[PDB]
Each structure stands twice: as C-alpha cells, then as structure tokens.
Design a protein around this ligand. Sequence first.
Ligand SMILES: Nc1nc(=O)c2ncn([C@H]3C[C@H](N)[C@@H](COP(=O)(O)OP(=O)(O)OP(=O)(O)O)O3)c2[nH]1
Ligand SMILES: [Ca+2]
Length: 579
Amino acid sequence: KMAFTLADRVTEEMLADKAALVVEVVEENYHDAPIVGIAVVNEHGRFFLRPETALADPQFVAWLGDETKKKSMFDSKRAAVALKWKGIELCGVSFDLLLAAYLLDPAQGVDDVAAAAKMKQYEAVRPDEAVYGKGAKRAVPDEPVLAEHLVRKAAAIWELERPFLDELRRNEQDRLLVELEQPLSSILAEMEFAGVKVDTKRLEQMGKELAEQLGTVEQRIYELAGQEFNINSPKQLGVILFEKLQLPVLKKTKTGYSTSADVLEKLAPYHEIVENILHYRQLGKLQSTYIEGLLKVVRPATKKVHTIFNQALTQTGRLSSTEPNLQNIPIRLEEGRKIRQAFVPSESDWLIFAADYSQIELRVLAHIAEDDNLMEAFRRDLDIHTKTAMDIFQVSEDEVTPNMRRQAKAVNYGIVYGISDYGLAQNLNISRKEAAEFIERYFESFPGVKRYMENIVQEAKQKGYVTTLLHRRRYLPDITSRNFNVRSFAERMAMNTPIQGSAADIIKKAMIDLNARLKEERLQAHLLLQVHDELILEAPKEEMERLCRLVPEVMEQAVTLRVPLKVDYHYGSTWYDAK
DNA sequence: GCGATCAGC
DNA sequence: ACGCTGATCGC
Ligand SMILES: Nc1nc(=O)c2ncn([C@H]3C[C@H](N)[C@@H](COP(=O)(O)OP(=O)(O)OP(=O)(O)O)O3)c2[nH]1
Ligand SMILES: [Ca+2]
C-alpha cells in the first residue's frame, strides 16, 4: 500500500541532511541484539535497507555518525546502543518521538510508534505487537511485511515531528525535550553500553556461604514450627502462624493472611519463629535476586552487567532500571550491603566514585512552598531527618542510630506527602491521637508546606494537571472524582509529583552538565549508574582528587534554588567501599 | 499473569 | 489510610 524502495544498495539520496530513521531491534533487551531492518524516509522518498547491506556500507556508516545529518527516530537510545554493539556510532538525533510523547502525557504508556501516532489521529501504521506477535509466537515477519512496517513507522515519525513539537511548545516543554531528555538519552546509551564490572568469583563464594546459612535458618524454622513446610508458600506459612500457632491476625490480603514484614515485626512478641522467618526471607532475597539473578545476566566474556535505563516509563520523570535493576542493590543491612563488594571498576587501578544529594526533595519542597522555617533549616544545612529522629525517638543528636534516622526519613517524607494519622501510627507503633498531634505540630512549624499542599491540589483541579520545575507534566483526572478514595489518591499525587519530578529534573540536568565538564577536562571518568538522587562513576585513581572537587560542584550548581543543594560523596575500590 | 512481598530511592 | 519503581515467587 505505502510506496517505498526495497533497496539493494545505498544511494546518495538516502543520505540527506534530514530524515526519519528506523533501526529495528525486536528483542526487548537490545544489548547485543540483532538489527532486523532499516528504514529511511526523507525528501527524496522512502527506503528499506537490509542491515547487512546498510551497516557494511561506508557511506551509510559515515552518515549515521555525522552529527550534521539530522535524524528523527522513536526510541533512539535503543538504536544507538544496538549500533554500539555493532561497532557503529549514531549521531545527529534531533527528535525522539518516544520521549516527546512521554513528556506530553506519561499516562498514555506509549511504547511503540502506533501508540504515539494515535495521539495525533495518525493511524497509517500498525502496533508492533500486531506485526511481531507475543510470547512464544513472537517472530520477525516475511521481508515485504517487515519492510512496509518499518517504512510506515518512519513515515509516521516524518509526519508527526511538527505536531508533537508544536504541542510541546504550547506546554513549555520543547526545551525539556531538546535540551534535557534527548541529550540525556545519549548519556544513558553510553552508560548502558559501558556496563558495570562484576567480581564473579566473590559473588559465587557469597552464594555458596549464603546457601549454607539458608539451610541452618531453614532447619531452625522447622524445629520451631514442629514440622516442615514451604516457608515461601503464602498459604502454608499463614497456616503455621495463624492456625497452628494461633497468632493474631493483624491484616488480610485479597488471597488470605498477610505475612508482610511490618506484620511479622508486630508478631515478634508472640513467637520467636517470626524473627527467623524474616531472616530466612532476607537471605533468600539476596540469593534469588542479588546473587543468582545477577549471575544470570552477567556477560561472561567481560564479567559486565548492562542495565537498561527506561527513560519513558515513570509517571514522575524518574528513570527505572531493568535486567538487572541496578537501582535497588541492598545497602541498609550489612548482610545485604556486602553484595556491593561484587561491583568493581572495569580497569585495574580505577576506583568507584559515588555522590548523592542530601534531602533533595525536602529542599525542593522548601523552595517550591517558600516555607520560611524549612528554608531556614536547609540554609543552616541541618540534617532534618536527624532532627526529626531526635524529636521522634526522644534522644539527642549523638544518640541517633542509623535505624532511627532511617525511620525518621519515612516520617519527614510521609508527612509532606499526605500520610494519615493511621499510617503514621502504624509505622511508629504509637497511638493514633499522638500521630495526629505530631502531624498537627509539623504543619504548625511549617505552615508554608501546608499551604502548598492545599494550593497544589486546587491548582490540579483548576488546570487538570501538575507540573515540575522544568515543566514536566502529569494529568490527574481523578482529582475531581466523586469517589473519596480515588480522589484522595489523586490529591496525594498532586502533592508528591511536583517534588519527586523536580528532583528528577535536577539530577538529569546535573548528568548533562557533568558529562560536558568531564569531556571539557579530558578526563577518563565516566558515569556508570544513576540511582534517583545519586550518581555512580568510575575513573583512574589519578583523577580522584579532581573528581572530589568537580562532581559535587556540578551537582550542587545544576539549578539555583532558594536553598542550597548539598552533595555527599565517597570513593573506593568497590561500590561497597564508596560509602 | 497477578498479587504479595521486598530491595532501592 | 505517604510517593515512585523492578525481580522473584507461589498461586
Ligand atoms: N514519599 C517518599 N517516601 C520515601 O520513603 C522516600 N525516600 C526517599 N524518597 C525520595 C525523597 C528523597 N529526597 C529522594 C532521595 O532518597 P534518599 O534516600 O537519598 O533521601 P535523603 O536524601 O533525604 O536521605 P540521606 O541524607 O541519607 O541521603 O527519594 C522518598 N519519598
Ligand atoms: Ca541522598
């Protein structure tokens, strides 16, 4: 139906200085994945190229790497990384339809060209699922079917760039796309392709020692329960605890008794088996997710793991990290924190450098709410979690433990994000009147925060959405829902999204600024990971002293707020030691 | 596949 | 009955 040239060779008219480009990678994980076809649409026509002809053509490779030849794409990071695995550099991406649709409305869940095209009543293209299938039936179709699908995707991108840019302009988001998300996409592509080196011998020895400790705790549980059972079975466990041992039923799920960690903590005074259960799960969590699961995805020839940072997924603008998730490696408990000893620099005599913001979301809140007391607190560089811990667990600053501060952090962030007296009472194991009066005291000390809570909800009802500092957007249609519970969830999103999202905006700009400074200084230091408010790098030891001065300054100066931004930093021979 | 659960931010 | 995620597991 749609006309195009099924090209046997690369011609000069395929290499214009503006074009829609499709470099199709069907496998969900695009690391070291096959490129199944290429399509180009420009002023001269529409073209399909087999990858073996295009990617071995010296003129096509040069065109791909020429920053002055502008390309419009969908999910350009997927193409850039897959091309890096083919030894080919992609430059000149000036428009990414995936990131443009994400900024316009993250709730659409746009994951292919067809979904983005439907936002502008363009339907001359099929969904990728319709072409490739699902599950064990997923397959690359016959070449004429594949070629037309890629051509139609490129033609869609070619037609949709201007209407998408027009609406982004109206939303004050065109700079958010062109100067933040698209430059970040190339940085993430470099981070993903570089990967993180894994000490595979240390990890396997940890796995062997962990299997022995799992057996000891497992036998102890059976000894305490009288019999043997599947401890990981939600049914069988609830039978032992709440039917055989007759422990109180504090909480139910849609499927039966709840055995979540908070419930098990409250059942500790009744039977010592529940503390062994918690220890068992924590060991099994490390074994299944952070030892076995990590070894599954290590590339054996390089001992590197290559995560994928999903840049167009979260509703607040944060990133997510998949296969493996390198944003939830344990750190709170020492037994789990040792996992980070297996994350090592990719070269000898290099080191891991870690730098994280201190209380960025509360500092963002102070700036946005213009709360006099909260701004004064951060202008003094007060540790507000520690101050809250002093005020919760009635001690002084020298007596605050890591656990008390860990718990005070959830109260500081819980309160500002609409925790109820019920939720606060359940978290601190205190009476509900006491939690209600603590929340009341909090908002009397910070009345500007309370005003912002009320104002941002009214702003959301009037405009239909909320925004971040760099004009990210999230629509909240449920904010005017007649169902109280549905409306309450939307109101807490209006409270939280501008703050979490602004913190995501700030660290994203910090990564762009940092990347530019690193190249300016001609340093070998490069980014490895982002963990929401935290940047992880590796570099030669000869660069550590310069990095200690460069990285915190870049992160602290990414934006200028009414309060200072504060960055802590550490380095060491492993990720574990970088703290 | 989903809901529970738990690791992080 | 604070927010945002992803992986694993048993059902
Ligand atoms: N609703 C909500 N509940 C939370 O329990 C919670 N936890 C962390 N976050 C957000 C706010 C932090 N600003 C940001 C960095 O998460 P982070 O752990 O580093 O918090 P913070 O910097 O203050 O403590 P720190 O000084 O030891 O570094 O992630 C949360 N939001
Ligand atoms: Ca932090």
